[PDB]
Design a binder for these strands. Structure first.
Ligand SMILES: [Ba+2]
Length: 613
DNA sequence: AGCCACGCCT
DNA sequence: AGACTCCTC
DNA sequence: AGGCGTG
DNA sequence: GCTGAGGAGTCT
């Protein structure tokens, strides 16, 4: 008797957001009215509204509307949605470009023929700009075009842009907790969730934690309307780039940059600057800063390197927004000055400042240092002794490299990946066991051993609503420092743990939490609780402790770069950590920091190159 | 941000 | 015939 | 070839 | 430049 998936999900979103008094203050009388109206619709009225909300926003031929599961003939249901002001019919179709756009090319040809002043053959787009130019001069004859255009097309519906705007803002709010933050996912229509969420959110069970908020993110309905606006803008720049429309992208960004400069001084911005970082990421300035970053990516594409340097120097001169992205920017600035603008003098100042900024970490930090040596250890450069200025010699210990071969075809051993091929070589190297997990092997172990500390009470504002799969500060520096004594304790305990405590603890979280959606944990990463326990037996306390300290101290900068593979031997307990390298992938900076660190914790690390044959 | 095929420089 | 757009899960 | 960078 | 896989229907 349950609702179809798309409905359950939609309703979950509605509930999750609205049961916060804070959040309700961001919707007026009129708007809440609409929300109630939705709940008043019949089931069939709801299923359909959601379907069409989940589709693209424009007119649709009533002939192209089939949903048997909803209702066998939809006329009643459409009437209802029209009565409610959720849907509008053809009678409100007045703008011409809309009538035409609705019509197909075969329909456009039939309309290019009965009208004499029109050329019958050509592309749909052509016939469009033609019929448009035709009506803009002799308006009166254009009125009878629109007349038949409508009559031809038949019956048509559209989602009403009024309420639509409300449900989006709601969906936008919901997305702050789970979505958007946990990667920038799919989302169709005009404002939506990730596929995962839309399909499953109804079924999903979450880690239990206590909602506790004490800080407003948005000042009023306006703040949230402005944030959404920038969000919409970024989404357009992002999309443009993905479609390779780099020029459109450039303009749109220039436009955005404009507005963000015009936007400073507004009273609301002082409030934002005061928000802790893990909340500051949901503010107009943050989104606008994000857009500036994309803007540097656009300039670079268009070989406008001086411009990109100017932009990067701008971004880097403020500490307010997106501080976590400083590494990427310092790194990018140095590459640009050194490689493209060939300006060696600044490249050093750049490198030096980057390395003096505590915000740069792991990969990017190493990358700067390496450029700095490549530079000091250069002739053209020797005209100086300023890279001699106390560079903390960050020499990375070296790592056993290994090469095997496999027949290329996707490889063959069955069609198989580069990783499974390696898993074979290790199987015949006396490691009967193996997981291909990359970061989630370690990550889910980190989750299992720290669950309760991760979903711990007492930190204001980190749980804002019912559908979180992590505390909002997880990827900030404040995650550790807020939970410092607790972590330091658990870490010490894990370090000292004999290999039955480790098995016990894992099982303790596993048995109570199995299934619960938690960003850190993949319940199917390990083929059973038993495998999870065998692995924690091989790695032992100290190794598990070290790995967790990093993942908890600085998840944002450490989440990436761990090896693809873990392999171990059941009876001997020997394990090895393997970073598989295809013919075309080499060691990233984050990868080399990780392998050094795992070596430091005393663990067999090995890079396995797979040559094609 | 990571993946990947490819290319420019040396 | 192949690119493109929209939709479902 | 090997190192470093782009799209 | 790619980022979901898969499919049906439309455009050039
Ligand atoms: Ba790899």
């Amino acid at each position: 008797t349950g609702h179809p998936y798309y409905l359950r999900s939609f309703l979950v979103v509605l509930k999750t957001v609205l049961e916060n008094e804070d959040d309700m203050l961001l919707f007026d009388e009129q708007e809440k009215g609409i929300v109630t109206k939705f709940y008043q619709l019949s089931a069939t009225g709801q299923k359909l509204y959601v379907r069409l909300f989940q589709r693209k926003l424009s007119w649709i031929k009533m002939t192209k509307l089939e949903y048997e599961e909803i209702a066998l003939d939809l006329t009643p249901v459409i009437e209802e949605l029209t009565n409610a002001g959720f849907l509008q019919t053809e009678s409100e179709l007045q703008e011409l470009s809309e009538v035409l756009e609705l019509l197909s090319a075969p329909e456009l040809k039939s309309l290019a023929k009965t009208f004499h002043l029109a050329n019958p053959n050509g592309q749909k787009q052509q016939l469009v700009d033609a019929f448009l130019k035709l009506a803009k001069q002799r308006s009166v004859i254009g009125a009878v075009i629109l007349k038949r255009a409508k009559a031809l097309a038949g019956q048509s519906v559209r989602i009403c842009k009024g309420p639509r705007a409300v449900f989006s803002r709601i969906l936008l709010l919901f997305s702050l907790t789970d979505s958007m933050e946990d990667e920038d996912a799919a989302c169709g229509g005009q404002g939506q969730l990730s596929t995962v969420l839309l399909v499953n959110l109804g079924r999903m069970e979450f880690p239990s934690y206590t909602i506790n908020r004490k800080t407003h993110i948005f000042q009023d309905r306006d703040d949230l309307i402005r944030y959404a606006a920038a969000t919409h803008m970024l989404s357009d720049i992002s999309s443009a780039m993905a479609n390779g429309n780099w020029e459109e992208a450039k303009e749109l960004a220039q436009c955005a940059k404009r507005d963000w400069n015009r936007l400073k001084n507004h009273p609301s911005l002082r409030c934002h600057e005061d928000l802790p970082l893990f909340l500051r990421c949901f503010t107009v300035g943050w989104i606008y800063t994000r857009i500036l970053s994309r803007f540097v990516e656009i300039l670079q594409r268009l070989h406008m390197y001086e411009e990109a340097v100017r932009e990067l120097e701008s971004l880097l001169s403020q500490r307010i927004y997106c501080p976590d992205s400083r590494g990427r920017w310092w790194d990018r600035l140095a590459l640009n000055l050194h490689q493209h603008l060939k300006r060696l003098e600044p490249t050093i100042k750049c490198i030096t400042e980057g390395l003096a900024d505590p915000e740069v970490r792991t990969g990017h930090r190493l990358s700067l240092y390496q450029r700095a040596v490549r530079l000091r250890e250069s002739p053209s450069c020797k005209k100086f002794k300023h890279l001699f200025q106390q560079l903390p010699e960050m020499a990375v210990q070296d790592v056993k490299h290994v090469t095997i071969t496999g027949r290329l075809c996707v490889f063959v051993m069955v069609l198989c990946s580069v990783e499974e091929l390696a898993l074979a070589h290790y199987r015949r190297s006396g490691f009967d066991q193996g997981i291909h997990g990359e970061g989630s092997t370690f990550s889910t172990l980190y989750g299992l051993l720290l669950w309760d500390i991760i979903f711990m009470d007492g930190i204001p504002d980190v749980f804002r609503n019912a559908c979180q799969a992590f505390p909002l500060d997880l990827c900030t520096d404040s995650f550790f420092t807020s939970r410092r004594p607790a972590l330091e304790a658990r870490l010490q305990l894990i370090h000292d743990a004999p290999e039955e405590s480790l098995r016990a603890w894992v099982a303790a979280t596993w048995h109570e939490q199995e299934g619960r959606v938690a960003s850190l944990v993949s319940w199917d990463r390990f083929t059973s609780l038993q495998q999870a326990q065998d692995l924690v037996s091989c790695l032992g306390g100290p190794v598990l402790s070290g790995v967790c300290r990093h993942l908890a101290a600085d998840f944002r900068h450490c989440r990436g770069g761990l090896p693809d593979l873990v392999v171990w031997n059941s009876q001997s307990r020997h394990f090895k950590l393997v970073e598989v390298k295809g013919p075309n992938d080499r060691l990233s900076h984050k990868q080399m920091i990780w392998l050094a660190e795992l070596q430091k914790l005393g663990a067999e690390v090995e890079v396995c190159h797979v040559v094609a044959v």
